[PDB]
Symmetry: C3
Subunit: 239 residues, 3 copies
């Protein structure tokens, strides 16, 4: 929900943010950053190009507090990279949390912990170099932070472990997940993915008939959208 | 003003910095980092490319202490992206300042206020992870970071307030600024912007004749220059 | 040697890391992060492209404990930016430490101090923004940070000094280093270096014939590899 966040993760360049900042009033800008669409691109690390920017500017040209709802991308699933970023990765993520709903919370919890271990090593160098002067005071602080990184390390280990077991269970349920992804990055097909877990069948049928069937695009959009894996105004097609 | 500002802002890649560090003496590197040209690119978000790097190395080899003064870009105002980043946006920031000179100061103050804000969050997410092991000596940090965040929040509200008001007049003074920008972005032309404020006429006249008049380019170069919106050696031109 | 470092250094994008995290097991991924080839890209600021990620994924399939020693780049030395990033800069770094072994360590110690002063600089801005409510507490707090950015700042001066002298000696040993570089960026050849130090003769001979002798690019690769300047699987050519 913050400029810096989209900047730190490379979603928006400084150049782009400059234009956006000047064209959109603070109120629209804030709505932009909070909107489901952009938050989606953030989570998938999908940086903006000139048309994304044009479309944002275009949509905001009406004083409708719901302008963000018209935002969405036209994705060509015939491009593996697009198939991966807009479909497979999102779907696998949704699927695993289905096996165990606490998993996304673990993965996210993890990152908050490593970025937290850093602040601990950085705050260690500090009171380390500082030990020069006020040596008695630094010792004090060092003992304090020493305890923290010890616990932080342990919380990480136990989380990792749960995820190790979780991934094992998921590997058992979709063994061909890996062989499928390689076949995609070469042949471009989705067959190496079979047999796919049952729940995914309603997605996989149309997904495999994208070039043959007309209403398969709509079928895939609709399946993802119900499952909250795409936007109402996202559109998918094939080469 | 350190190389870190330029790395974080994606103005200079890691690859590029390494080459510059090897080729430029420590003293020239710092002169480069503080020079007006590179500062302009930073503010505008204009990442360096092969040529910008070469020119840096070139100009720096003269060994004159004002070598930075020879740095500039050759800019094709054909490209809508170039028209926007080198003219429209700088010019609008300048125009804006006429209507109220305190504005530029307010904007960057927000930037620093946002940073201080972010810093306080990192500082609270930090002491939250400590609150578990150090329950007692954590009730003190949260109290200061409380008022700190509150205060910070107050002034943002104020700044954002003044700027919201300024925006309103600024909109009134150039109604079709929006429309003009949409059009340029959709079709490449400048017509959507008119009528333009009278104080920008001597810039606009040449701007709309880049392709036709031969002295139209340097006429906008001169206009921007006399107002510190470009560098002495920045060269503009038109080619479609 | 963590993901976060490769992100901040702009070596791996958010979306690239998204895919690797999902495709590689926790163990397999950390192996990638600590492997020589990737540490090489990192040292030189060489961002992963589409090719590099495919390779990482193919080589991940082998499923042996040393997969990531098969990783290497294919570089076209006919491209000047490649000539610089893979040969000239690496070779110079190696050369200069022949003149004085302490130089790489100074160079690296600067970096540590530079990121450290900018850590205290940001710490100042904060406590001056917090001096709004606490003038007293923020005093001894700004006072400590001020001592640190003092010692830091002199350590830097001492190192810069030592490097200033080194610089002079290296300039005397390879006078046309700079003219060569300028020329390569201008005309794309290597004659501008031409009076090169004797210890580089064996590298220089084949480097000047990449286009003419089939075996030249291999000679170059050998020269580099025997001195740990490229990976065993790095491969060079001229197109």
């Amino acid at each position: 929900a913050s400029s810096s966040l989209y900047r730190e993760s490379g979603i928006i360049s400084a150049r782009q943010l400059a234009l956006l900042q000047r064209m959109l009033p603070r109120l629209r800008l804030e709505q932009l950053f909070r909107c489901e669409w952009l938050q989606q691109r953030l989570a998938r690390g999908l940086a903006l190009g000139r048309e994304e920017v044009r479309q944002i500017l275009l949509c905001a040209a009406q004083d409708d507090d719901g302008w963000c709802a018209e935002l969405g991308d036209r994705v060509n699933l015939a491009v593996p990279q697009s198939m991966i970023d807009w479909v497979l990765l999102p779907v696998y993520g949704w699927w695993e949390s289905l096996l165990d709903q606490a998993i996304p919370g673990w993965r996210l919890s993890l990152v908050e912990l490593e970025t937290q271990s850093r602040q601990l090593r950085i705050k260690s160098e500090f009171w380390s170099r500082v030990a020069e002067l006020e040596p008695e005071q630094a010792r004090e602080e060092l003992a304090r932070v020493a305890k923290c990184q010890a616990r932080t390390q342990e919380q990480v280990a136990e989380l990792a472990g749960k995820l190790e077991t979780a991934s094992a269970l998921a590997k058992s349920a979709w063994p061909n997940w890996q062989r499928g992804m390689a076949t995609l990055l070469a042949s471009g097909g989705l067959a190496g993915f079979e047999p796919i877990p049952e729940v995914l069948e309603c997605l996989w049928q149309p997904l495999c008939r994208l070039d043959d069937d007309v209403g398969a695009a709509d079928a895939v959009q609709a399946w993802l959208h119900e499952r909250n894996l795409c936007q109402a105004q996202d559109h998918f097609y094939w080469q």
